[PDB]
Write an enzyme that holds these catalytic residues in place. Structure first.
Site, mmCIF file in Angstrom:
data_model
loop_
_atom_site.group_PDB
_atom_site.id
_atom_site.type_symbol
_atom_site.label_atom_id
_atom_site.label_comp_id
_atom_site.label_asym_id
_atom_site.label_seq_id
_atom_site.Cartn_x
_atom_site.Cartn_y
_atom_site.Cartn_z
ATOM 1 N N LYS A 1 45.071 42.826 38.483
ATOM 2 C CA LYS A 1 44.470 41.870 37.555
ATOM 3 C C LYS A 1 45.387 41.623 36.359
ATOM 4 C CE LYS A 1 40.734 41.529 40.052
ATOM 5 N NZ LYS A 1 40.445 40.265 40.813
ATOM 6 N N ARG B 1 34.543 51.334 46.086
ATOM 7 C CA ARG B 1 35.616 50.523 46.639
ATOM 8 C C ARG B 1 36.314 51.266 47.767
ATOM 9 N NH1 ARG B 1 36.516 45.091 44.427
ATOM 10 N NH2 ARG B 1 34.941 45.054 42.745
ATOM 11 N N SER C 1 34.034 38.086 40.595
ATOM 12 C CA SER C 1 34.070 39.472 41.030
ATOM 13 C C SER C 1 32.757 39.859 41.692
ATOM 14 C CB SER C 1 34.350 40.354 39.816
ATOM 15 O OG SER C 1 35.552 39.924 39.201
ATOM 16 N N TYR D 1 40.386 53.637 36.704
ATOM 17 C CA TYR D 1 39.643 52.923 37.729
ATOM 18 C C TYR D 1 40.236 51.545 37.996
ATOM 19 C CZ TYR D 1 35.767 51.752 40.727
ATOM 20 O OH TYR D 1 34.980 51.476 41.825
ATOM 21 N N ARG E 1 35.621 47.700 35.591
ATOM 22 C CA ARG E 1 36.360 47.101 34.496
ATOM 23 C C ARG E 1 35.532 47.088 33.218
ATOM 24 N NH1 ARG E 1 36.416 42.413 34.919
ATOM 25 N NH2 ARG E 1 35.620 42.105 37.059
ATOM 26 N N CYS F 1 31.367 38.631 44.291
ATOM 27 C CA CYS F 1 30.556 37.488 44.700
ATOM 28 C C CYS F 1 31.011 36.841 46.007
ATOM 29 C CB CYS F 1 30.504 36.428 43.593
ATOM 30 S SG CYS F 1 29.609 37.005 42.106
ATOM 31 N N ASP G 1 41.887 38.120 47.317
ATOM 32 C CA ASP G 1 41.542 38.296 45.912
ATOM 33 C C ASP G 1 42.403 37.488 44.941
ATOM 34 O OD1 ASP G 1 39.769 39.891 44.017
ATOM 35 O OD2 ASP G 1 41.731 40.633 43.327
ATOM 36 N N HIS H 1 42.034 33.591 40.998
ATOM 37 C CA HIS H 1 41.178 34.632 41.576
ATOM 38 C C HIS H 1 40.555 34.093 42.867
ATOM 39 C CE1 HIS H 1 37.572 37.597 40.861
ATOM 40 N NE2 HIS H 1 38.499 38.146 41.630
HETATM 41 N N1 LIG Z 1 23.752 37.919 50.422
HETATM 42 C C1 LIG Z 1 25.082 37.827 50.560
HETATM 43 N N2 LIG Z 1 25.877 38.839 50.081
HETATM 44 C C2 LIG Z 1 27.221 38.755 50.222
HETATM 45 C C3 LIG Z 1 27.810 37.653 50.829
HETATM 46 N N3 LIG Z 1 29.151 37.863 50.819
HETATM 47 C C4 LIG Z 1 29.406 39.046 50.208
HETATM 48 N N4 LIG Z 1 28.206 39.607 49.843
HETATM 49 C C5 LIG Z 1 27.981 40.891 49.159
HETATM 50 O O1 LIG Z 1 28.435 40.805 47.822
HETATM 51 C C6 LIG Z 1 29.137 41.970 47.441
HETATM 52 C C7 LIG Z 1 30.534 41.518 47.007
HETATM 53 O O2 LIG Z 1 31.154 40.906 48.130
HETATM 54 P P1 LIG Z 1 32.756 40.860 48.181
HETATM 55 O O3 LIG Z 1 33.168 39.997 49.343
HETATM 56 O O4 LIG Z 1 33.313 42.264 48.224
HETATM 57 O O5 LIG Z 1 33.106 40.202 46.749
HETATM 58 P P2 LIG Z 1 34.561 39.871 46.165
HETATM 59 O O6 LIG Z 1 34.490 38.426 45.697
HETATM 60 O O7 LIG Z 1 35.647 40.135 47.168
HETATM 61 O O8 LIG Z 1 34.670 40.832 44.888
HETATM 62 P P3 LIG Z 1 35.987 41.385 44.141
HETATM 63 O O9 LIG Z 1 36.783 42.166 45.167
HETATM 64 O O10 LIG Z 1 35.466 42.287 43.062
HETATM 65 O O11 LIG Z 1 36.810 40.289 43.531
HETATM 66 C C8 LIG Z 1 29.103 42.912 48.640
HETATM 67 O O12 LIG Z 1 28.026 43.808 48.419
HETATM 68 C C9 LIG Z 1 28.787 42.005 49.817
HETATM 69 O O13 LIG Z 1 28.071 42.639 50.869
HETATM 70 C C10 LIG Z 1 27.002 36.626 51.324
HETATM 71 O O14 LIG Z 1 27.450 35.617 51.892
HETATM 72 N N5 LIG Z 1 25.641 36.725 51.176
HETATM 73 O O1 LIG Z 2 36.511 42.946 39.743
HETATM 74 C C1 LIG Z 2 37.201 42.275 40.530
HETATM 75 O O2 LIG Z 2 37.307 41.034 40.583
HETATM 76 C C2 LIG Z 2 38.075 43.094 41.546
HETATM 77 O O3 LIG Z 2 38.744 42.552 42.415
HETATM 78 C C3 LIG Z 2 38.046 44.593 41.362
HETATM 79 S S1 LIG Z 2 39.146 45.278 40.102
HETATM 80 O O4 LIG Z 2 40.489 45.255 40.714
HETATM 81 O O5 LIG Z 2 39.060 44.448 38.890
HETATM 82 O O6 LIG Z 2 38.667 46.647 39.869
HETATM 83 MG MG LIG Z 3 37.124 41.602 47.133
HETATM 84 MN MN LIG Z 4 38.593 40.284 42.254
#
Ligand SMILES: Nc1nc2c(ncn2[C@@H]2O[C@H](COP(=O)(O)OP(=O)(O)OP(=O)(O)O)[C@@H](O)[C@H]2O)c(=O)[nH]1
Ligand SMILES: O=C(O)C(=O)CS(=O)(=O)O
Ligand SMILES: [Mg+2]
Ligand SMILES: [Mn+2]
Length: 615
Positions: free
Chosen positions: A225, A395, A267, A216, A77, A269, A294, A245
């Site tokens: 979003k 992704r 995002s 993307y 983004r 996290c 999400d 979110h």
């Molecule tokens: N150290 C650590 N890393 C984590 C943890 N949970 C997720 N991660 C890492 O953080 C990154 C993002 O994790 P996601 O669960 O995909 O994050 P998200 O909040 O779904 O992100 P968006 O889809 O962009 O909204 C990945 O590389 C994970 O492996 C955790 O509890 N501890």
């Molecule tokens: O960035 C985020 O919080 C996502 O879930 C990925 S995107 O849909 O914004 O590319």
């Molecule tokens: Mg996610």
């Molecule tokens: Mn997201």
């Protein structure tokens, strides 16, 4: 005008007229209406394979799956190019980029004029929320990208069934998307068309979404979003509901009681990993199921409960870090019928990303890969240069129904009642592992003031702490202070029923040690924190009162199967006076920026925390 090729099942005159107007503006060579069928998906995937945008993966290792790699300028983004063009600047607010709507329209009109020359315009009809349900909204995205079309098939309820709901008079959210790379007669296309100039523009009064230059993810899949957070948050403010979110999960304890929690992390996290975590050793009899990972739409009911639905139909998840130890339900989900974007390609035609080596023989890296930029990659290159085989924001796109832990109510339009909210940012310091807010107002304060280190999910410098209220900094569709007020007013409505309000927790998985490694193991071990929240929901969990709320003692958590000492627990749960004094001054800077319409309750809560720090 150009032949629209309008299917016979489209009975909506206003929709057809809007398409005609956009075709006159964008001037595509041809128009194709997506019916959403599996057969069409396969044909569009084959078309992407012929363009070089997709590589088909080895059918024996990854059935019916594809790999796309994007231009390095188009991997995330672009928050600085994303605009809320409300009539008044104060209804965009300090967390959004604003431009006078007539001035933005004059900026975009020459960019969209002829943007689709040499390309097909795909008409992508979709429903956010289950088709025909009272809570669903229909959108129509026009795009010159077949990649958008096939990803929308997975991420939304897409295709001809939408027109039975629209009927002759139904309204729709109008979304226009172009990669901004018109093709002259005979010009050779690139595998990932895009433009270095990008705009993602929302007009809330008309619910219009315009996207230029990016192919993307969240820039181009406009149901996600742009509509289901930015436009929807505006609708919710007007109509008494929330677009957040947030993941939504169900958790059942060994006594068979089931609870639902909604969690807002920024995002990249942790939401997707938390939303389908597997309970680790020590939690026999517990189960965790996924409603969504999400986006949540939430509204209060007369019974005093808050009901949440997931408006999406799939997961668009960060790949790096995913393996059978961190997120096995995700690993199983992407066994097939998946689109991968910007991961690496193995010699046998499978995909690879950093983290997968934790499941490999000897936990070793692959001998050779083609990285997401098409370059040769080896462990030696990675050792000497740190080159990532998969982009940090690479992704997967996969249907929710691939998830073994999918909740049986994941598509129930009646929603699930939320027993607790969780907020948490990526913080190397300061924030303890888990804190329960003492009141709804204090929880709103927690959520409003949370910080988080930037990630690769948007362009710019990663690893920088910023304020990210409610994990909605990139996604709030109106003035952030009014949104704070919305959350405060929602709590008062719930309390006036006589109900007990959902508890609000702050969490931090991401405290770092002196070497920059994470002190808390996280992933499935986050179940141990969730189980304390469940104990508190039941009124059976103990905790201690501290400056920012109530926190568990070491003995209040289940440590069976995890080697994590009381000393390690003290590190990640101690309240450090100096760090919180610094943090509250950063809250003060936020409150100055958000002065306009800032609820007085927030300054009152800040003063109370300051007293507790100086006590
Ligand atoms: N150290 C650590 N890393 C984590 C943890 N949970 C997720 N991660 C890492 O953080 C990154 C993002 O994790 P996601 O669960 O995909 O994050 P998200 O909040 O779904 O992100 P968006 O889809 O962009 O909204 C990945 O590389 C994970 O492996 C955790 O509890 N501890
Ligand atoms: O960035 C985020 O919080 C996502 O879930 C990925 S995107 O849909 O914004 O590319
Ligand atoms: Mg996610
Ligand atoms: Mn997201």
């Amino acid at each position: 005008g150009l032949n629209l090729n309008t299917p016979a099942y489209v009975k909506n005159a206003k929709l057809i007229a809007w398409v005609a107007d956009m075709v006159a503006l964008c001037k595509p060579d041809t128009v194709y209406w997506c019916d959403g069928s599996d057969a069409e998906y396969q044909r569009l995937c084959q078309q992407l394979v012929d363009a070089g945008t997709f590589k088909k993966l080895n059918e024996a290792k990854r059935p019916n799956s594809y790999l796309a790699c994007s231009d390095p300028s188009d991997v995330a983004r672009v928050e600085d190019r994303t605009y809320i063009c409300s009539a008044k600047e104060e209804n965009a607010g300090p967390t959004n980029n604003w431009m006078e709507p007539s001035e933005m329209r004059a900026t975009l009109q020459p960019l969209f004029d002829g943007c689709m020359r040499g390309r097909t315009m795909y008409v992508v009809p979709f429903s956010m929320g289950p088709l025909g349900s009272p809570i669903a909204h229909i959108g129509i995205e026009l795009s010159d990208s077949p990649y958008v079309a096939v990803n929308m098939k997975i991420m939304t309820r897409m295709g001809k069934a939408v027109f039975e709901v629209l009927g002759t008079e139904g309204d729709f959210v109008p979304c226009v998307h172009t990669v901004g790379a018109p093709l002259a007669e005979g010009e050779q296309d690139v595998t990932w068309p895009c433009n270095k100039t990008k705009y993602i523009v929302h007009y809330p009064e008309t619910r219009e979404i315009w996207s230029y230059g990016s192919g993307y993810g969240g820039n181009a899949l406009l149901g996600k979003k742009c509509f289901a957070l930015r436009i929807a948050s505006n609708m919710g403010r007007d109509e008494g509901w929330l677009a957040e979110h947030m993941l939504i999960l169900g958790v059942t304890n060994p006594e068979g009681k089931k609870y639902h929690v909604a969690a807002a992390f920024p995002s990249a996290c942790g939401k997707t990993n938390f939303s389908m975590l597997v309970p680790p050793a020590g939690f026999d009899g517990w189960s965790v199921t996924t409603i969504g990972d999400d986006i949540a739409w939430i509204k209060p009911a007369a019974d005093g409960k808050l009901y949440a639905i997931n408006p999406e139909a799939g997961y668009f998840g960060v790949a790096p870090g995913t393996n059978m130890l961190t997120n096995p339900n995700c690993m199983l989900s992407v066994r097939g019928n998946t689109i991968f974007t910007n991961v690496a390609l193995t010699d046998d035609g499978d995909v690879w990303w950093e983290g997968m080596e934790q499941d490999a023989p000897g936990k070793a890296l692959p001998d050779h890969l083609i990285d997401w930029q098409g370059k040769d990659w080896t462990p030696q290159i990675a050792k000497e240069t740190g080159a990532k085989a998969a982009h940090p924001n690479s992704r997967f796109t996969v249907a929710a129904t691939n998830n073994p832990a999918l909740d049986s109510a994941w598509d129930d339009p009646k929603g699930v009642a939320i027993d607790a909210f969780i907020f948490g940012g990526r913080r190397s310091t300061t924030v303890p592992l888990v804190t329960e807010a003492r009141s709804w107002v204090e929880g709103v304060y927690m959520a409003a003031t949370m910080g988080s280190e930037t990630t690769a999910a948007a362009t710019g410098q990663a690893g920088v702490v910023r304020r990210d209220p409610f994990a909605m900094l990139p996604f709030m569709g109106y003035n952030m202070s009014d949104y704070f007020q919305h959350w405060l007013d929602l709590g008062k409505k719930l309390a006036a029923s006589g109900a007990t309000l959902p508890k609000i927790y702050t969490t931090n998985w991401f405290r770092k040690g002196t070497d920059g490694k994470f002190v808390w193991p996280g992933y499935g071990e986050n179940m141990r924190v969730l189980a304390w929240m469940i104990d508190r929901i039941e009124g059976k969990g103990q905790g201690e009162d501290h400056v920012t709320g109530i926190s568990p003692s070491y003995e209040d958590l289940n440590w069976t199967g995890l080697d994590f000492s009381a000393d390690q627990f003290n590190t990640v749960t101690s309240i450090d006076k100096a760090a919180w004094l610094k943090e509250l001054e950063l809250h003060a800077e936020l409150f100055k920026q958000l002065e306009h319409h800032l609820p007085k309750e927030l300054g009152e809560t800040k003063a109370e925390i300051e007293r507790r720090l100086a006590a």
